[PDB]
């Protein structure tokens, strides 16, 4: 009844496609890294979590905002927090 | 459920229609034109 695997992926997929700075919308997958796979950098990736938090209405602590560096970790980190709506 | 829209409009329509109606009769009195008597 809670957040599902298919729900989070399709929601996040439509989000990072909102950049004009990624390599291409077709270069994002479940295991896509924010730096090696798709085109971001040190300062862009932290804006992604500060948009992910907004569009899941949660709070990302600074200690846990650094391990998150790939789409797959974003998918699983959401599922670990039951407060996500 | 379109029933919610009808009650919203009805209350707004009933409200506003009241102000014009309550201004057609009581309006001149509080503007200093016509005393009630």
């Amino acid at each position: 009844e809670g957040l599902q695997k298919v729900e989070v992926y399709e929601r996040i997929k439509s989000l990072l496609a909102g950049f004009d700075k990624v390599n291409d919308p077709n270069n994002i997958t479940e295991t896509a890294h924010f730096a090696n796979d798709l085109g971001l950098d040190s300062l862009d990736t932290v804006e992604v979590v500060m948009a992910i938090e907004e569009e899941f209405s949660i709070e990302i602590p600074d200690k846990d905002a650094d391990q998150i560096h790939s789409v797959d970790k974003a998918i699983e980190y959401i599922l670990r927090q039951p407060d996500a709506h | 459920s379109r029933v919610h829209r009808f009650l919203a409009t009805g209350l707004g329509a009933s409200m506003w229609f009241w102000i014009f109606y309550r201004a057609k009769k009581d309006g001149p009195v509080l503007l200093g034109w016509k005393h009630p008597w």
Partner: protein
């Protein structure tokens, strides 16, 4: 050290601009201006300058701090936080006589 803290203050900066300017149109211009400031001083190398530079912007975050920042309802400090907390120990009491 000197890298994580810089990124943390970036989020705090964008968070505080939205907290003060509610309108998402207008914070977007503000947020774009902030990213320029972080990009401008990207190549600073000397650790003595890096620590001083980080210290200064912490005062800026303090000098324009919001009287009350936004906090999602389930977040610590949110409206719904700790509302219907379940019991920690679901197991029945052990057999004791009192």
């Amino acid at each position: 050290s000197n890298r994580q803290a810089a990124l943390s203050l970036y989020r705090r900066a964008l968070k505080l601009a939205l907290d003060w300017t509610v309108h998402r149109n207008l914070w977007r211009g503000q947020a774009l201006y902030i990213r320029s400031l972080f990009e401008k001083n990207r190549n600073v190398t000397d650790p003595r300058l890096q620590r001083a530079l980080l210290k200064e912007t912490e005062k800026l975050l303090e000098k324009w701090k919001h009287p009350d920042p936004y906090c999602p309802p389930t977040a610590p400090g949110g409206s719904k936080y700790e509302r219907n907390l379940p019991v920690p120990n679901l197991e029945p009491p052990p057999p004791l006589k009192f």
